[PDB]
Structure 1
Amino acid sequence: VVGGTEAQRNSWPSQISLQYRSGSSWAHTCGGTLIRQNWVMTAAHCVDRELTFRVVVGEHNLNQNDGTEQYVGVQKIVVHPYWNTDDVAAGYDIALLRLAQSVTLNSYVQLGVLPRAGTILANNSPCYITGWGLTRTNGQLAQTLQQAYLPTVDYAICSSSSYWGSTVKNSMVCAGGDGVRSGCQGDSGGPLHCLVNGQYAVHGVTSFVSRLGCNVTRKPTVFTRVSAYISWINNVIASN
């Protein structure tokens, strides 16, 4: 997250760190959202590589003992069947991870609430992106979980020529684009939390930013629209 602030440790308890094994250690690669005690929602592109993955819930600082973490292996990966890694613009950037164990819930570890199917946010709706992704274009991962206020940019504006044009689909949410705040590499797969009727819900799964840079004006961060995938999510969980 470029232009973020450090999140309070109990603000976003559904945020997870998706990590891969690298040598004798683990490296953060993506975010995710805990959606059942044994299921995480993330981006399909996060799991394109044939890696050993684990999830950390109750994570705040990637580089220090928080005293709240639970580390759990990924047991099964179910990528959306229409995902194509060389066509992120087509959409379908979503995957579910079944965890090896059911995590224990507490103020640091909670299920993310998803919107009702079909819900589309009005332009300029209030949301926060969260994650450990780069803090500058071509920068480095954050140590502490970051948040940035990224209001939505509706489909009509987001798909206009000076924004994303044809690249954005109605199955996506755009947010931000102010040239200061954005998602960045390593935020992918994590939530866009939007405040509606007094409650935050996870309306987005971080999918892409401009190839030119993270915080590029009129290139808002683009998210998979969770509310387009409610039936898909429920079907996968019911069948697994």
Structure 2
Amino acid sequence: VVGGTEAQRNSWPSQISLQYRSGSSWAHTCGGTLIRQNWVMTAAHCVDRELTFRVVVGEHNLNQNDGTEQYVGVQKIVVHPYWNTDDVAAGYDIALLRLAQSVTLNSYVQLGVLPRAGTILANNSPCYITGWGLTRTNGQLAQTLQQAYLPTVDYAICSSSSYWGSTVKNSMVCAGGDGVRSGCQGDSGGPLHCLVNGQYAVHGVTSFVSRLGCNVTRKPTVFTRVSAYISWINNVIASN
């Protein structure tokens, strides 16, 4: 998250850190959203590689004991069957991870609430992106969970020529684009939390930014629109 501020440790308890094994250690690669005690919603591109993944729930500082973490292996990965890794602009950047164990809920570990199917936010709706991704373009990961205020940019504006043109699809949510604040690498798969009727819900799964860089004016961060995938998500959880 570029231009973010440090999240309070109990503000976004469905955020997870998706990590892969590297040697005798684990490296954060992506975010995700806990949506069931044994299911995480993340971006399909996050699990393109044939790695060993784990999820950490109740994580705040990647590199320090918080006293609240639960570490759990990924037992099954269900990528959207229409996903194509060399066409992120096609969409379908969404995947569900079944955990090897059901995690325990507490103030630090809670299910993310998802929007109702079909729901589209008004232009400039209030949202926060959260994650441990780079804090600058070609920078380094955040040690502590970051949040940045990233109002939505609706499909008409974001699919216009000045913005993303035909690269963005209506199955995506755009947010930000102010040149200062953005998602960045390592935020992929994590949530966009948008305030609706007084409740935050996860409307977006972070998918991509500009090849030019993370905080690029008129290149808002692009997210998979969760409310386009509610039936998919329910079908997968019900079948697995």
1:58 offset after TM fit, Å?
Answer: 0.2
CA distance in 1, matches of 2:55, 2:121: 29
1:186 offset after TM fit, Å?
Answer: 0.1
1:54 offset after TM fit, Å?
Answer: 0.1
Deviation string 1:14-63 (CA, Å, 9 cap, x unpaired) is 00000000000000000000000000000000000000000000000001
Deviation string 1:119-173 (CA, Å, 9 cap, x unpaired) is 0000000000000000000000000000000000000000000000000000000
Percent of pairs identical after alignment? 100
Deviation string 1:209-234 (CA, Å, 9 cap, x unpaired) is 00000000000000000000000000
Provide the alpha-carbon RMSD of the alignment. 0.2
Please give the secondary structure, in 2, of the residue aligned with 1:237.
helix
1:66 offset after TM fit, Å?
Answer: 0.2
Please give the secondary structure, in 1, of the residue aligned with 2:135.
coil
Structure 1: stretches of 5+ with no match in the other structure: none
CA distance in 2, matches of 1:222, 1:112: 19
1:88 offset after TM fit, Å?
Answer: 0.2
1:184 offset after TM fit, Å?
Answer: 0.2
Deviation string 1:96-120 (CA, Å, 9 cap, x unpaired) is 0000000000000000000000000
Task: Give the aligned partner of residue 160 of structure 2.
Answer: 160
Please give the secondary structure, in 2, of the residue aligned with 1:203.
strand
1:75 offset after TM fit, Å?
Answer: 0.2
**1:80-229 equivalences in 2 (<5 Å):** 80-229=80-229
CA distance in 2, matches of 1:134, 1:228: 27
CA distance in 2, matches of 1:212, 1:221: 12
CA distance in 1, matches of 2:236, 2:50: 21
Task: Give the aligned partner of residue 35 of structure 1.
Answer: 35
CA distance in 1, matches of 2:183, 2:27: 19
1:7 offset after TM fit, Å?
Answer: 0.1
Please give the secondary structure, in 1, of the residue aligned with 2:45.
helix
Please give the secondary structure, in 1, of the residue aligned with 2:203.
strand
Aligned length: 240
Moved over 4 A (4+): none
1:65 offset after TM fit, Å?
Answer: 0.2
TM-score, scaled to structure 2? 1.00
Deviation string 1:179-226 (CA, Å, 9 cap, x unpaired) is 000000000000000000000000000000000000000000000000
Please give the secondary structure, in 1, of the residue aligned with 2:129.
strand
TM-score, scaled to structure 1? 1.00
Please give the secondary structure, in 1, of the residue aligned with 2:202.
strand
CA distance in 2, matches of 1:230, 1:10: 26
Please give the secondary structure, in 2, of the residue aligned with 1:231.
helix
